[PDB]
Amino acid sequence: KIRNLPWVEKYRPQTLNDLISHQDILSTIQKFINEDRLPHLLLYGPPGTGKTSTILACAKQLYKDKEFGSMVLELNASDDRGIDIIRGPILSFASTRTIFKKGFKLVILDEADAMTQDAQNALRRVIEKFTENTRFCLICNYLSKIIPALQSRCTRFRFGPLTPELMVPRLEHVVEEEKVDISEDGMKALVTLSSGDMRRALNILQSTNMAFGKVTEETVYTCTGHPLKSDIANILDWMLNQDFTTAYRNITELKTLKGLALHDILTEIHLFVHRVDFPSSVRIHLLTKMADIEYRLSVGTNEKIQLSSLIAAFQVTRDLIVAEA
Amino acid sequence: ASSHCLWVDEFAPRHYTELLSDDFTNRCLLKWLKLWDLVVFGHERPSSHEQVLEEMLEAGLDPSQRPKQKVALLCGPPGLGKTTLAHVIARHAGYSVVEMNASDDRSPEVFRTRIEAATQMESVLGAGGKPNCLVIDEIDGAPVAAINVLLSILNRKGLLMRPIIC
Amino acid sequence: MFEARLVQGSILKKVLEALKDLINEACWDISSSGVNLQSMDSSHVSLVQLTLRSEGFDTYRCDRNLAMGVNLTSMSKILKCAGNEDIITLRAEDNADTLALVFEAPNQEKVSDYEMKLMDLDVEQLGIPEQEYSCVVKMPSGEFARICRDLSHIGDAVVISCAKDGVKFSASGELGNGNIKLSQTSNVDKEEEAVTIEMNEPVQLTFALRYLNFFTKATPLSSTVTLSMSADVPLVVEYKIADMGHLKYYLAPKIEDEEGS
Amino acid sequence: MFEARLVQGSILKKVLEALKDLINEACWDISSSGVNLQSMDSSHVSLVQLTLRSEGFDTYRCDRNLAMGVNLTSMSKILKCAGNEDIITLRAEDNADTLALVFEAPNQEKVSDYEMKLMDLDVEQLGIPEQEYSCVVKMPSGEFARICRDLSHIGDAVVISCAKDGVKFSASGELGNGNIKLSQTSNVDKEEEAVTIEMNEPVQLTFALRYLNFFTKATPLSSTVTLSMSADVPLVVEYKIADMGHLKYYLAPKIEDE
Amino acid sequence: HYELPWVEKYRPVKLNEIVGNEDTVSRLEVFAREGNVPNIIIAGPPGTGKTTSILCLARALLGPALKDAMLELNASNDRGIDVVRNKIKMFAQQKVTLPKGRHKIIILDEADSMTDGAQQALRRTMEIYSKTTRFALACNASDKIIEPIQSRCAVLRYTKLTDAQILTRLMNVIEKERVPYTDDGLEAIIFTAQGDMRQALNNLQSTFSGFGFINSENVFKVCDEPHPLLVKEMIQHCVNANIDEAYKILAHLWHLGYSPEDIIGNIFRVCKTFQMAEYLKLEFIKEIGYTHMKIAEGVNSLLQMAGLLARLCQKTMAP
DNA sequence: TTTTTTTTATGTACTCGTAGTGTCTGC
DNA sequence: GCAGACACTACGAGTACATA
């Protein structure tokens, strides 16, 4: 039936075959499940890569719908997970048998980096003592906020960023299941602006399809507000080729015409600053100045002065690069 | 029972002559405990930082026949023999050691009902029973209200008749 | 349109005070047969199956079947200010969120209408096996509550055994062990105080005391409780209300590992 | 093998409630003559000497002499669930670490078997307290409990003075002064209320109220109590039970006299 | 029945099967054979075998009396101030009939989680009842255990397991499990373990379940190379003011999905123990802290980490 | 050879004191 | 049948720390 859902939740990989990228990790987890050798897992990686979807597909594969509420204990950062919960419901769930059917139980701890260190220290002997009865899956974005004692007990899988070559067919499946007219440059802009994230590629696809009705390069870069590659090349050419006043006028006209933001301009100019074969003394100064300009934009600071400083960081090094020869 | 006990408990000092502390501290604690013989045992005869202790050992008594410092405080780094010196000096001067350490409840009501029991009563063995020397181990872990209870029972003018070692 | 009518308010107060520290949220399944509630606890160890009959209410009408999930702290605060001898009306519309509790003051003069907002949890149905048990014991509820309270002072996990002789409770704790065994207490003037054994095969299972003590809070609901045990199916505590329905408590055994030696 | 079947659990309940907040452990000494318990406080303030002879039980089996050092709270937790009029089987082995109590307390054929883990204590020895008391009086237990509660209402310590006329109790406080005068009350029908005086050389001492209340909490244990006090010898209360044995409480006086 | 993972299935039950720290393990074997063991606190890195050594020593000392002469407490238990007074002290006062040279053992696993008040209350009940009971504590951070408790026990310290010590136990597990392997695969497992036997067994079981053979690429398709092994190289490049190679390593760590907090934590961890000038090390640490304040306040991009690397390279050329 | 005191803004955890309150005893 | 006493858990309050 038709449902009113966001496309990041309407199109969720309910099975392990619907995830795209981490084929070796998913093959190893599938062979863990099929041989009943599932250990305590530690899924870590950047957001939007499919860790919660992986553990929910594994839990739906392991357990039927008539027994899913008694075998799976799913706790996350929206739940209270203090040390009284580790000593309370989690220990009682781990230390007791099942109700309906005999089997091993699963305690999913989503956002395990949000737990306090007291709870993580209390979890160690709960994990180690009841390995036969229950299994634990810790999922985090930052591995440093998990204590090394819990990192030793759980085998860790790095759910790295999704490569855009493998991100395309899932987006094509979502497009063909939603009747969306998309061009090749629209798909390329989607997998460029996503940057290893399938949430942001679905959100941007749904937002562009609602705003314009078609998904092309211009529509995606207009709905997102991101500058194009040609605009960044023009900004760099103006900052390296002419004086302060003409470059300031041209960049100000380009920003007023297309409604660009200085954060995305700074990000793309930072990406361009390493491809350009600059001297090493020039690159250090440019990176320090651009990091300072990016830091100044985090508060109530006028963006026009920061645009002038972004021009100034290159107008300083123009004559240095030229006289270097 | 050589294989039954630890080597610290096997080689623990049982007399004054086999202690390993500073001899000045041993003599000062022994003289401070022997200053209570006029009010505890009822006998006139028993048988820098050093200068203040020597002055306080010879400073005289209050008209209530007691030393002017009714509490001895023993401080130092761990692993020296402070508890050993307190127990050896208490058993050497004819006292019976009453121990009150950090494994007790240390609430002010329990602290009061233990100090008042150890210090304000005589012996249940009648004549010839040893007096009670209250040794309070780990007093720095006690709460401030327990210290206020100890100071209130030290400054009751309910007069304190027994020595207290902290 | 759902409209039930409790003739007295005491039984609903006892039910919602029995489940207050145990059940996270109440799922009233409404049909023409009666009111059903199958809900697990917050630890996913216990299970509560309450079945209230349509003949026990004053008036009961139910056009279409409903499944009303509601919070329990709010309903506990509503039922705290309810009398024990007043008629309490539960109302619910077809496509609305307001579950209405209408009752009277303890002064019995003014009316009170307390609405509740229904929750939207999608809960998969838990399949009760309804199989035969290897041990069925009919015993008084007050003695069961007393023996659970007396074993709570000794330990935390209790080994309950049952055989042809009778039920037996053991608590191997820190002070020591406490082993209480009861049997054949039917030779009294009362009919509620009786121990009857029906089934054959002896079973020994270890359970938590906190959940047993939460289960014993339904003592005023039934004078006689039933204990069902087997080697695979969990512990069932059955309270049979007089003319309203019944209440089932399911508690899973704990994981006990023998010594390697 | 040690077995002792106490005929009624009421005396065990009243004893273990009397020395509940008094002594930190129970050191039962087991011989063929009976059960001995000689406990002393760590601050040497109060002493308990309980003797239960072998003729006072339903049965008594003892092969070897035993020392049962057991926790007081762990036994009070048991006999909060015991029966007032029921048989209590206290059993232990010769070389064991446990102590079992079997009873049918609710009179509903509910066989209760509570085991305790023994506590290993250092074996201090107190042989015999010397008994040469000049002032020996006899008093009912209920009146003594009531007058100890009456001084506990006002003061914090009792000045007890023996005399030929009677035992006089005094208490000082900010709210008021509590004072009674004991007279010869032998002209009554009850023989338990009669106060028999066998004193000489009168003595006035001071005692703590809390230990006196803990001693007088055993009023239903025996109908009549015996008080024995003298100079520089601690005060003795003595409850003589009907068939099982006797119980002696020793209290040291305070240093601050009067 | 369900098959346990190889961490829990191949836990050693005898003290001779424990590899690494041969002197301390040999003395524990002697103490388990004879008796009269002093109070013991074992500190070390995770996965070294401290809990295994404590449990094997307690089992070999007691035998059939393990269920009645041992009290095991963890961070999953309460062990507050009311448990040291009322449970540990009551177990130390408890009479248990044992042979000569054998004592009751109170195992306090993960003693860092205990509060300071509980450790203060533990002192006198450890010192008094030492004729009848003994204490066997295990910990990771030895500074959390206070000085009186460390004085009341023998403080054994475990070091990280060497590659040969991990390799011997892994070859025992391989010959028990019939795992086909190559030498570069076991070298990769030893490299990804980093002194942790738990991680070695977990990586070996993951590679054997996912691929069925142990070579280097089958290990690295599921396991990962350690972070500080490249962070040390990028810090060395920042010392020589080489911004291009440092940014190459930074971009390689960025494209692998590491958050800026983890990257700057590894950068601080390497710079804390790096071999360079002390004043330059302090300037590096101050610049890392200044960048980490911006990372924690909300701005955390590749430009900020590149600016941190540029500032570290500028600190070299500005004496 | 040398020692007092409350600010940082939440969130969690520990510890301790206090107050309704269900239940048991007694006349 | 009703006043007094007992322990019981829920709740209010004060304090510390949070890193490698």
Ligand SMILES: Nc1ncnc2c1ncn2[C@@H]1O[C@H](COP(=O)(O)OP(=O)(O)OP(O)(O)=S)[C@@H](O)[C@H]1O
């Ligand atoms: N590998 C993937 N295959 C298909 N859809 C994906 C994949 N990764 C992410 N998605 C989409 O993103 C949604 C949410 O992914 P999550 O499971 O939340 O990823 P995650 O990496 O666990 O996120 P964090 O780290 O918890 S914010 C899914 O329901 C899909 O719509």
Ligand SMILES: Nc1ncnc2c1ncn2[C@@H]1O[C@H](COP(=O)(O)OP(=O)(O)OP(O)(O)=S)[C@@H](O)[C@H]1O
């Ligand atoms: N002369 C001695 N020879 C051998 N062992 C000794 C000697 N004196 C003391 N000891 C032992 O060393 C320890 C002395 O510490 P204690 O006096 O018990 O406590 P402490 O010295 O106050 O240190 P802390 O602060 O309590 S840890 C005990 O284990 C004694 O048995």
Ligand SMILES: Nc1ncnc2c1ncn2[C@@H]1O[C@H](COP(=O)(O)OP(=O)(O)OP(O)(O)=S)[C@@H](O)[C@H]1O
């Ligand atoms: N030295 C070792 N020899 C053999 N196996 C070991 C060794 N160290 C660890 N293991 C294995 O790793 C498992 C975990 O060992 P533990 O003793 O629990 O680690 P740990 O030293 O306690 O570290 P932490 O601080 O508790 S996480 C054991 O069950 C063994 O399977």
Ligand SMILES: [Mg+2]
């Ligand atoms: Mg997620």
Ligand SMILES: [Mg+2]
């Ligand atoms: Mg000491």
Ligand SMILES: [Mg+2]
């Ligand atoms: Mg461990």
